[PDB]
Amino acid sequence: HHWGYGKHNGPEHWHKDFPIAKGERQSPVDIDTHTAKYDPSLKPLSVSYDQATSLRILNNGHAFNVEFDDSQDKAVLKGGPLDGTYRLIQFHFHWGSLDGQGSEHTVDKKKYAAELHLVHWNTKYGDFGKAVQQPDGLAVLGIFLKVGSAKPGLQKVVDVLDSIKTKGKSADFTNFDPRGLLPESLDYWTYPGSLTTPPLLECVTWIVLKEPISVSSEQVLKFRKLNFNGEGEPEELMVDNWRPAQPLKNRQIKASFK
Ligand SMILES: CSc1nc(Cl)c(C=O)c(NCc2ccc(S(N)(=O)=O)cc2)n1
Ligand SMILES: [Zn+2]
C-alpha cells in the first residue's frame, strides 16, 4: 500500500508515512500575482543547457523522467535567486485527465494542463542524495503547459512514450536538447519549498516561469496513454499525477519582473 495518486493512496494520505507533508515549507503553492512583490535585487536567471547530455527515459510508476549525465559540469542553472551552481539531473511533468487541470503550482487559482519540472542539485553538496538533506540543496525550474499550438521541441519525448508505457520500463534517450522546452521569457516567481512527491523534503528553491509553453492536444493526449501500473497488470491510466496547492504559511513569493 505504497503512495500514489489513486483513489486510496493520494496526496491527502501522504502525511501518514511522511509527516513533513504538513510542514512549514511545502510545495506546490498558489501564486497570488497581486501579492508577489517585485524584488529588484533578483538577478536574471542563467540557464546553460548547450552541453546537456540526456541518457535515458524512465516510467517510474508516478511520471516519466528524462535523465541526464550529471557526472560533470555541463547543464547548469545559476543566477536568479540562487547562490552558486546547480546541475541538471532530470526533468519530468505532472498532468491532468482533462485540459482544465494538471499543474501543481497555480496562478491566481488558475490550473494549467501540465507542469514541467527541470530538477537541479547544488554542486556544493557533491551529489543529489546529500543535496536533498539541505535547505538550499535543489533548484527546480517549473514551466506551465497550456493546450494550443504544438511544441516541436517536445515531440521527440512524445514519440518515445509508447516504448515506456508501464511502470519500470526504460528506453535509451540520447541527444535530447531541453532548450527546446523553454518559453521566450525567463521572467519568474521564486519561493522556498519542497519536493512535491514523497519524501516531500524541504530542500527546494522553486523558480516558476511566468510564460507558459504551448503544446498540442495530441501531444498531451499521448501523456495520458501512459500507465501507473506495471506490465501485465490491470490498466490504470497515468493521469492526475499532481499534488494540490499547499498552505503558504510564513513565506513570501518574490517576482523577478515589473
Ligand atoms: C530523495 S533521493 C532522490 N534521488 C534521486 Cl537521484 C532523485 C532523482 O530525481 C530523486 N528525485 C525525487 C524528486 C521528487 C520530486 C521532485 S519535484 N516533483 O518536486 O520536481 C523532484 C525530485 N530523489
Ligand atoms: Zn515534479
Coordinates of C-alpha atoms and ligand atoms in Angstrom, one line a residue:
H1 CA 0.0 0.0 0.0
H2 CA 2.6 2.5 -1.4
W3 CA 1.9 6.2 -2.0
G4 CA 0.3 7.3 -5.3
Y5 CA -2.4 9.4 -6.9
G6 CA -5.1 6.7 -6.8
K7 CA -8.5 6.7 -5.0
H8 CA -7.0 5.5 -1.7
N9 CA -3.3 6.5 -1.5
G10 CA -3.3 10.0 -2.9
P11 CA -2.0 13.3 -1.6
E12 CA -4.5 13.5 1.3
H13 CA -2.9 10.3 2.6
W14 CA 0.8 11.1 2.3
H15 CA 1.2 12.6 5.8
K16 CA 0.8 9.2 7.4
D17 CA 4.1 7.9 6.0
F18 CA 5.6 11.4 5.5
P19 CA 4.6 13.7 8.4
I20 CA 6.6 16.6 6.8
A21 CA 3.6 16.7 4.4
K22 CA 2.0 19.1 6.9
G23 CA 5.3 21.1 7.3
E24 CA 6.1 24.8 7.1
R25 CA 7.6 25.0 3.6
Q26 CA 5.6 22.5 1.4
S27 CA 5.1 22.7 -2.3
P28 CA 3.3 23.4 -4.6
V29 CA 1.5 26.7 -3.8
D30 CA -0.9 29.1 -5.3
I31 CA 0.9 32.1 -6.7
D32 CA -1.1 35.2 -5.9
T33 CA 0.2 37.6 -8.6
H34 CA -1.0 40.7 -6.8
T35 CA 0.7 39.8 -3.6
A36 CA 4.1 38.6 -5.0
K37 CA 6.4 41.5 -4.6
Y38 CA 8.9 42.6 -7.3
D39 CA 12.4 42.2 -5.9
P40 CA 14.9 44.4 -7.8
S41 CA 17.7 42.6 -6.0
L42 CA 16.9 39.4 -8.0
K43 CA 19.1 38.6 -11.0
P44 CA 18.2 37.3 -14.5
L45 CA 18.1 33.5 -14.5
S46 CA 21.1 31.8 -16.2
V47 CA 20.1 28.6 -17.9
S48 CA 23.1 26.9 -19.7
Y49 CA 21.9 23.8 -21.4
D50 CA 24.1 23.9 -24.6
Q51 CA 26.2 21.0 -23.2
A52 CA 23.3 18.9 -21.7
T53 CA 23.6 15.1 -22.2
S54 CA 20.4 13.2 -22.0
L55 CA 20.8 9.4 -21.4
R56 CA 17.5 7.6 -20.7
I57 CA 13.8 8.0 -20.2
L58 CA 12.1 6.1 -17.4
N59 CA 8.5 5.3 -16.4
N60 CA 8.8 5.2 -12.6
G61 CA 5.1 4.5 -11.9
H62 CA 4.4 8.1 -11.0
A63 CA 5.6 10.1 -14.0
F64 CA 8.3 9.7 -16.7
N65 CA 11.8 11.1 -16.0
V66 CA 14.2 12.2 -18.8
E67 CA 17.6 11.6 -17.2
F68 CA 20.8 13.5 -17.8
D69 CA 24.5 12.8 -17.3
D70 CA 25.4 14.9 -14.3
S71 CA 28.9 13.5 -13.7
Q72 CA 30.5 16.8 -14.8
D73 CA 29.5 20.4 -15.1
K74 CA 27.6 20.6 -18.3
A75 CA 23.9 21.7 -18.0
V76 CA 23.7 24.3 -15.1
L77 CA 21.2 26.7 -13.6
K78 CA 22.5 29.7 -11.7
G79 CA 21.8 33.4 -11.0
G80 CA 18.2 34.4 -10.3
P81 CA 17.7 33.9 -6.5
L82 CA 20.5 31.3 -6.4
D83 CA 23.9 31.3 -4.8
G84 CA 26.3 29.0 -6.6
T85 CA 25.7 26.4 -9.3
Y86 CA 23.0 23.8 -9.7
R87 CA 23.4 20.8 -12.1
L88 CA 20.6 19.4 -14.2
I89 CA 19.8 15.7 -13.3
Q90 CA 16.3 15.0 -14.8
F91 CA 13.1 16.5 -15.9
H92 CA 9.6 15.3 -15.7
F93 CA 6.0 16.5 -16.0
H94 CA 2.7 16.5 -13.9
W95 CA -0.5 16.5 -15.9
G96 CA -4.3 16.0 -15.8
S97 CA -7.1 13.8 -17.1
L98 CA -8.5 16.9 -18.8
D99 CA -7.0 20.1 -20.1
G100 CA -8.6 22.1 -17.1
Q101 CA -6.2 20.6 -14.6
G102 CA -2.8 19.1 -14.2
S103 CA -0.4 21.8 -12.9
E104 CA 0.9 21.7 -9.4
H105 CA 1.5 25.4 -8.9
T106 CA -1.5 27.6 -9.7
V107 CA -1.6 31.3 -10.7
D108 CA -4.4 33.3 -9.0
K109 CA -6.1 29.8 -8.7
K110 CA -5.7 29.1 -12.4
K111 CA -4.7 25.4 -13.2
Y112 CA -2.7 24.7 -16.3
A113 CA -2.9 21.5 -18.3
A114 CA 0.5 20.4 -17.2
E115 CA 3.7 21.5 -15.5
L116 CA 7.3 20.7 -16.4
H117 CA 9.9 20.3 -13.6
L118 CA 13.7 20.7 -14.5
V119 CA 15.4 19.4 -11.5
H120 CA 18.9 20.6 -10.4
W121 CA 21.2 19.9 -7.4
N122 CA 23.6 22.2 -5.7
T123 CA 27.2 21.2 -6.6
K124 CA 28.5 22.4 -3.2
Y125 CA 26.9 19.2 -1.8
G126 CA 28.7 16.8 -4.1
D127 CA 25.7 14.6 -5.1
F128 CA 21.9 14.6 -5.2
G129 CA 21.5 12.3 -2.1
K130 CA 23.4 14.8 0.0
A131 CA 21.8 17.8 -1.6
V132 CA 18.2 16.8 -0.7
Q133 CA 19.3 16.9 3.0
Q134 CA 19.9 20.6 2.8
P135 CA 17.5 23.6 2.7
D136 CA 19.3 25.0 -0.3
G137 CA 20.1 21.6 -1.9
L138 CA 17.9 21.7 -5.0
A139 CA 16.6 24.2 -7.6
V140 CA 13.6 23.2 -9.6
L141 CA 12.6 25.2 -12.6
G142 CA 8.8 25.0 -13.2
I143 CA 7.2 25.7 -16.6
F144 CA 3.5 25.7 -17.2
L145 CA 1.9 24.0 -20.3
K146 CA -1.3 25.1 -22.0
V147 CA -3.0 23.4 -24.9
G148 CA -2.9 25.1 -28.2
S149 CA -0.2 25.0 -30.9
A150 CA 2.3 22.1 -30.8
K151 CA 5.7 22.4 -29.2
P152 CA 8.1 20.9 -31.9
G153 CA 10.8 20.5 -29.2
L154 CA 8.6 18.1 -27.2
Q155 CA 7.8 15.7 -30.0
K156 CA 10.8 13.5 -29.5
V157 CA 9.6 12.9 -25.9
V158 CA 6.0 12.2 -27.0
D159 CA 7.1 9.7 -29.6
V160 CA 9.2 7.5 -27.3
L161 CA 6.3 7.2 -24.7
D162 CA 4.8 4.1 -26.4
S163 CA 8.0 2.3 -25.6
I164 CA 7.8 3.0 -21.8
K165 CA 4.1 2.5 -21.3
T166 CA 4.2 0.7 -17.9
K167 CA 6.0 1.2 -14.6
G168 CA 9.6 0.1 -14.6
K169 CA 10.1 0.4 -18.4
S170 CA 13.0 2.5 -19.7
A171 CA 14.4 3.4 -23.1
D172 CA 17.6 4.9 -24.4
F173 CA 17.1 8.7 -24.9
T174 CA 20.2 10.4 -26.1
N175 CA 20.9 13.8 -27.6
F176 CA 17.7 15.4 -26.5
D177 CA 18.0 19.2 -26.1
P178 CA 15.9 20.6 -23.3
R179 CA 16.4 24.2 -24.6
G180 CA 13.5 23.3 -26.9
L181 CA 11.1 23.2 -23.9
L182 CA 11.8 26.8 -22.7
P183 CA 9.5 29.7 -23.3
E184 CA 10.7 33.0 -24.8
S185 CA 10.8 34.9 -21.5
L186 CA 12.6 33.9 -18.3
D187 CA 10.6 36.2 -16.0
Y188 CA 9.9 34.2 -12.9
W189 CA 8.4 33.9 -9.4
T190 CA 10.5 32.3 -6.6
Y191 CA 9.9 31.0 -3.1
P192 CA 11.4 28.3 -0.7
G193 CA 9.6 25.0 -0.8
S194 CA 9.8 21.2 -1.1
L195 CA 9.7 18.1 -3.3
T196 CA 6.1 17.7 -4.4
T197 CA 6.2 13.9 -4.1
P198 CA 7.3 11.7 -1.2
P199 CA 9.6 12.1 0.6
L200 CA 8.5 15.8 0.4
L201 CA 11.8 17.0 1.6
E202 CA 12.1 20.8 2.3
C203 CA 15.1 21.3 0.2
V204 CA 14.0 23.2 -2.9
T205 CA 14.4 26.8 -4.2
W206 CA 11.4 27.0 -6.6
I207 CA 11.7 29.1 -9.7
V208 CA 8.4 29.2 -11.7
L209 CA 8.4 30.8 -15.1
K210 CA 5.5 33.3 -15.8
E211 CA 5.2 32.4 -19.5
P212 CA 3.7 29.0 -20.3
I213 CA 4.7 27.0 -23.3
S214 CA 2.0 25.8 -25.7
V215 CA 1.7 22.1 -26.5
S216 CA -0.9 20.5 -28.8
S217 CA -4.0 18.5 -27.7
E218 CA -2.4 15.4 -29.5
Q219 CA 0.8 15.8 -27.5
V220 CA -0.8 15.9 -24.1
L221 CA -3.2 13.1 -25.1
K222 CA -0.2 10.9 -25.5
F223 CA 1.0 11.7 -22.0
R224 CA -2.4 10.4 -20.9
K225 CA -1.9 7.0 -22.6
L226 CA 0.9 6.1 -20.1
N227 CA 0.2 3.7 -17.3
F228 CA 0.8 3.8 -13.5
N229 CA 0.7 0.0 -13.4
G230 CA 3.4 -2.5 -14.4
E231 CA 3.2 -4.7 -17.4
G232 CA 0.6 -7.4 -17.2
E233 CA -1.4 -5.6 -14.5
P234 CA -4.9 -4.1 -14.9
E235 CA -4.6 -0.8 -16.7
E236 CA -4.5 2.4 -14.6
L237 CA -4.0 5.4 -16.9
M238 CA -1.3 7.8 -15.8
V239 CA -3.4 10.9 -15.3
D240 CA -3.8 13.5 -12.5
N241 CA -0.3 12.9 -11.1
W242 CA -0.3 16.3 -9.4
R243 CA -0.3 17.5 -5.8
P244 CA -2.7 20.3 -5.0
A245 CA -1.6 23.7 -3.6
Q246 CA -0.4 23.7 0.0
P247 CA -0.5 26.4 2.7
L248 CA 1.9 29.2 2.0
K249 CA 2.3 29.8 5.8
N250 CA 5.2 32.1 6.7
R251 CA 6.6 32.6 3.1
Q252 CA 6.9 35.4 0.6
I253 CA 6.8 34.7 -3.2
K254 CA 9.1 37.2 -5.0
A255 CA 8.8 38.3 -8.6
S256 CA 11.8 38.9 -10.9
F257 CA 9.8 41.4 -13.0
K258 CA 7.9 44.7 -13.2
Ligands
LIG1 C1 15.3 11.7 -2.2 S1 16.6 10.8 -3.1 C2 16.5 11.1 -4.8 N1 17.5 10.7 -5.6 C3 17.4 11.0 -6.9 CL1 18.7 10.5 -8.0 C4 16.2 11.6 -7.4 C5 16.1 11.8 -8.9 O1 15.3 12.7 -9.3 C6 15.2 11.9 -6.6 N2 14.0 12.5 -7.0 C7 13.0 13.0 -6.1 C8 12.2 14.2 -6.6 C9 10.9 14.3 -6.2 C10 10.1 15.3 -6.6 C11 10.7 16.3 -7.4 S2 9.6 17.6 -7.8 N3 8.1 17.0 -8.3 O2 9.4 18.5 -6.6 O3 10.2 18.3 -9.0 C12 12.0 16.3 -7.8 C13 12.8 15.2 -7.5 N4 15.4 11.6 -5.3
ZN2 ZN 7.7 17.4 -10.2

